[PDB]
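Ticket reopened. Same input as before:
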Amino acid sequence: PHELESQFILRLPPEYASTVRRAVQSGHVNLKDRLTIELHPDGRHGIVRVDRVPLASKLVDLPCVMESLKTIDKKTFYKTADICQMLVSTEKKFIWNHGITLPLKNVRKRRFRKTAKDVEKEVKRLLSTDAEAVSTRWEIIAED
Amino acid sequence: PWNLSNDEYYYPKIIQHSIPAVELRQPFFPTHMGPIKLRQFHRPPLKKYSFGALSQPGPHSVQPLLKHIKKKAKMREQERQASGGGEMFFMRTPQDLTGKDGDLILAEYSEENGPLMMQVGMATKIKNYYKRKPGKDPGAPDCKYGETVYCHTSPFLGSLHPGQLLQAFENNLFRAPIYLHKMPETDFLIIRTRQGYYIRELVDIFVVGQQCPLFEVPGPNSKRANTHIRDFLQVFIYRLFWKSKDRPRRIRMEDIKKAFPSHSESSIRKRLKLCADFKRTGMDSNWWVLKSDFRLPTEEEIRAMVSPEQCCAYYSMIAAEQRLKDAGDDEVRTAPWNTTRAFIAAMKGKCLLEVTGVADPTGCGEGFSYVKIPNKRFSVAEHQERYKEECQRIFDLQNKVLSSTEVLSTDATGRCLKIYRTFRDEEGKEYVRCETVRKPAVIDAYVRIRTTKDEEF
Amino acid sequence: GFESPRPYKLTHQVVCINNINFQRKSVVGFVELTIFPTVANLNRIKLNSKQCRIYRVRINDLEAAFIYNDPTLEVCHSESKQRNLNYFSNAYAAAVSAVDPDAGNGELCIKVPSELWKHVDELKVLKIHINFSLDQPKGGLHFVVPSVEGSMAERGAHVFSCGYQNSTRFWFPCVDSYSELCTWKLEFTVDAAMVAVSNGDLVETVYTHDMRKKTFHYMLTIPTAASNISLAIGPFEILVDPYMHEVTHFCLPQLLPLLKHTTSYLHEVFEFYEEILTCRYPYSCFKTVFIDEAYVEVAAYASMSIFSTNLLHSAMIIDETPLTRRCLAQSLAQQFFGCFISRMSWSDEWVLKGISGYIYGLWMKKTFGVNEYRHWIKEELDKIVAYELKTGGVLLHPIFNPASHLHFSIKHPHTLSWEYYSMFQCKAHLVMRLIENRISMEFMLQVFNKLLSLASTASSQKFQSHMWSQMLVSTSGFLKSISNVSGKDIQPLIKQWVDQSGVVKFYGSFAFNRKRNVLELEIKQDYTSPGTQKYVGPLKVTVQELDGSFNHTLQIEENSLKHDIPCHSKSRRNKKKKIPLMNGEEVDMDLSAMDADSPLLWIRIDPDMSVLRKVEFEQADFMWQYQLRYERDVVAQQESILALEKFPTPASRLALTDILEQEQCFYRVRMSACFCLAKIANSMVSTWTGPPAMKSLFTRMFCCKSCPNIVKTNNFMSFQSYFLQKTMPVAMALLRDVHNLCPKEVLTFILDLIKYNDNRKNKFSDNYYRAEMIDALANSVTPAVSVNNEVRTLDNLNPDVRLILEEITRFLNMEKLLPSYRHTITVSCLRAIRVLQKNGHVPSDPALFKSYAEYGHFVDIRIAALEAVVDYTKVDRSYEELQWLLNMIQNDPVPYVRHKILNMLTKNPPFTKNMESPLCNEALVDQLWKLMNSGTSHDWRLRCGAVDLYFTLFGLSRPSCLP
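Engineering reply: fixed in the latest deploy. New output:
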């Protein structure tokens, strides 16, 4: 079978980003030894090791949706993957408010329309507790 | 001396996808999307592998792929020059759609949930619309990507200024203004697969403005919706019959039940009733063999049954159905069937749109709202001109804000719910737990089930 | 690749004109050509010249000897007793080929002096200075000099260059081919009160030392041919376009407000033609000249167009705005693709005519709507299938005879019949629409942009034709550019519709198989008629069934007859649901007339007109009525109207009446439904129940609610109920009773429409509506019951016709005091008097029409009166009227009138070859042979018209009525 590839964006500190960029544009396999990525079983924490120097990482959710688009002639572009996550290196904490491009900053707060009426999972847990019970008493309340 | 052809009563109103996309192959075009997969629609999380090299916990080296990129590009140029030197079609396999080769650009979206969105494997074009200056003009400012076209009639809602080039994504699904920005100096692109990590740099990232929809998303329980569900199931059944190696072609029912698990089996039987029959005993037992008089349709007929853009419109409809369902009339107006119907009707000239409203995906004055207003002490030129000028103003504000490289500084009853629970502890006990829910969101979802279960008797 | 047929290459030409004398009708001038010999030993140089008296010729300021002979002056000898037309056609083709600049030939043969042979062998420049004089031109320059006294600017006298194709040899010596491109320098010394308009841009205007004359200097740096060079000298009122500022409009004096209103649309035509093609307008200026006694209604030269003043209308004139608008549009289309990109041979003319007509049709589509585009395309296709089934066929791109089925030679444009030239341009633009159907419209516009871009990179070089021949298109270059932009070649389509000269005829009939639910079509072709050919390609058919509209492609090979296509359900008759149409909409249909067993509502063979075809489909009458009512295609509604005349059932009357009542139907379908309803009403007399047809509908739509017989006061601001209102009594007058006489209920209705007409309140004129009222009065005239050939006097007049005669007398006399826009009521009243004379009502006397056909009248009155005289001399076998018409062909001042008299005498001939007539002398054969041979030697359009008249009257063999 075929499994859709999973692309994400890696953001590094600027000096380490310059060393990683120089090693990528060089093209040797020396970069392979220099750059490693260890993702912790939390799922939202990691180490990126640049030149064997550990950096602390967080996998965050991006507010917009990006899409990688490949081309052969630079006139027709084929969508290859959807990017929604970034492993910035240096829950509410795992949500990034800004977008990658310069015009998109504070997009989640300002350029996103918010419509409102985790919570569903809590309601399911409450229903399960009511089922495991015997007698349930309920009242919409006031200030108390 | 005028038109005099009643054209609105007689006539009321190129993209080649990859061979995995036009054949609707199941990684790229899913048969069924559950609720947690509809909430993560076009935002796929980073899954943990169970088997593979990355499934073992520990540090993992990323691998540079620049010999791979230039080897694949040199190989594709050899293929193109061996085939006569013209333009070729290369995306014939799923392994052609990897990010490991070719010139990748990134495309960011301004809206959170667009009315239409491309699946993986589908093609789009970049068109550079350039309105010439009055009289003499030097020529279109040249651009790295796309082809240039001179537009006297603006494709979008606003109109282009003289001497203004605007790039845009153009395909069958939408048409949307894009703006080229340079990448940040810190961000790279990591392509992870089961075997390892791979790293590319990126240099070009476009920002995609508000989409102008060219395909109408169907509504829920619509006739077009049910027709697409039936045709998609039929195409999947035909492609399972084509994949069968048995000389009387035969399939199993629980393959289709694995693909479409929300379907009642009465509908799947209905699709298999014509073109197949069930063998209970003897050879081919518990199989749905193909009828001997039935000619299985060819590949081009199966491609003519369902289009990939219809699948994208259906996925937009069911994702919006989930988001509306989770959030308990303003929201219903912002649903893509309403907004796509409004925009396509405005493009034929049926009706006008209030460009400031609640269907505005920004939530501020930037961007349009595609909801229908009637085209009616002026009742004619005043309304039309007012709508037109508001359209040019919004188009021009969005272009400026999006192309800005300026840095932006980081910035009813009032009643809670209380529940008493009675349980029995180990040995013998009867403790009672009183729990108070102060979250009005938890409240609404909780109560709605009881009121439903109270009527469910 | 273009290789010249001439042994020299012409680089630059100076045309200087002095002494334009309007009293004596004379010009003097010189011409200086700058040729580079391409072959050594050039010796003779052969140039083209007609009617010019060549005074002296100097080559490199050395006196040279010339000899002039024109074989096309007298084509056959006077003392040859041949009288067949094939002899004259071969001799005329040989004579035109002997003066052809497209071969090496020419009429003026200049001998290079001996001392320049060492200058010509090593190939160096030669400057030939001819000076000439036109003494009193019979062609080329037309002098319109009115007989009011005063100065020549005070009386309105002007000159313009007339003619078609290569007719610039008629006023200066040149290389009069479309392939000899050169740069130009044009000087004209005219009177001080006059302006000289020509090609190029006006670099200066200097006075003469007496300040009584001034010289206009024009320069043309874009290399054009000699055939695209024009001239208009007159006392023109100049108007700069207030929108585009390089465009100047010139009109005759006192016609400036008409020019302001008329030429106010042209900037939108410029914007369209520069927005579908991506090239700007190639010339640096544009000049529109409006003149009197024009050759054609619109002529297009390089950077200049010459229209007639009869196109000029005011703001209150409707029914003339679209015609003038489309004349301006096709002049601009020919500016792009007849004058900038020129022709490489006489073959490859179909390319230029097709591109001009095709982009003009795209303009008509955007401007007047897709429905007007479809109606225009259908009327052009019906025109060509009528002409090609009538006589042989039109052959685009012949190979050099290739077409021997027709009485003239197609090797040169000046031997073609004028009807063949018109059908040539018509077929060329329809074949270009077919090429757009195979290769999509955006690729087609990319082809045209590639041709224009090659021409405009070519147009700026100075190399003498190393690169100036990229401005000349050919067929092979056009097909190669098509294959470059698309990757498909159209060589089967080119081989079928260009190289082969025929249209196809389809006879279709269907049968529905209820058992297998299929539709068995039966399409057979008539390929043994003289104009036809056999089609073997694919064929689209559109079937409207209850489940919707489905298209099917049929492969019609030679041995094919029965095509079984599948049919869908009939479950939209089980439930009442709406039936979906060809577009996205759906309607409620009354399915009571439909068959119970068949789902299919109508069938259309080749709906998109993708072949050059004539379809004869055999549907049932209810299918034609459903196709008339619920179709969303105007050509299918028109063909259902045309096919409902054979079914006079009352359901068809209900169908046409529902079409007539229906706004949001295209107006030209309702105008056809009027005449179809009149024919059906005439066929079901002694069955018709109530009032006459369309009368109650006219009183419901256009009359007052309180008074049914009083018409509403005229408000013509809707432009669709105006056309329907002015066409409905014209069809209503074709009603006839059981006695074959028009009823006195419809004639009284038309007379009350005439009496109660009030036009003091609309912003538009009433001349076309009143002219159509006279046409409706003329339609009601039935033949009178003369007893014993009783002389038609005033007392034994019909009581019906006395009212009609009083009305047309009142209208014609009121036109003599308050004239209409183009004397439309004079034309309608002369036509009605000829209608009354054709029946036995008014005495058959041509003296009235002979007085209206004099020179000083308006040209529409003249051609209406001459049409009446041609009809009289056909019916009364008049010898002296035929001699009057032939004399008027020989010496009339306006050449358009001479061409029109020959045209009308060809269309309505006094006798055919089958008839024994008293007018079949040897004297008439000798007169018409002298008119073909000599006499018409100065026009190239009168000579082809005389050939057409001799063919119509005496045929291709020897005139029979002869010793």
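Chain B touches chain A through 126 residues (CB under 8 Å). The first strand of chain B starts at residue 60 and ends at 64. Please confirm and we'll close it.
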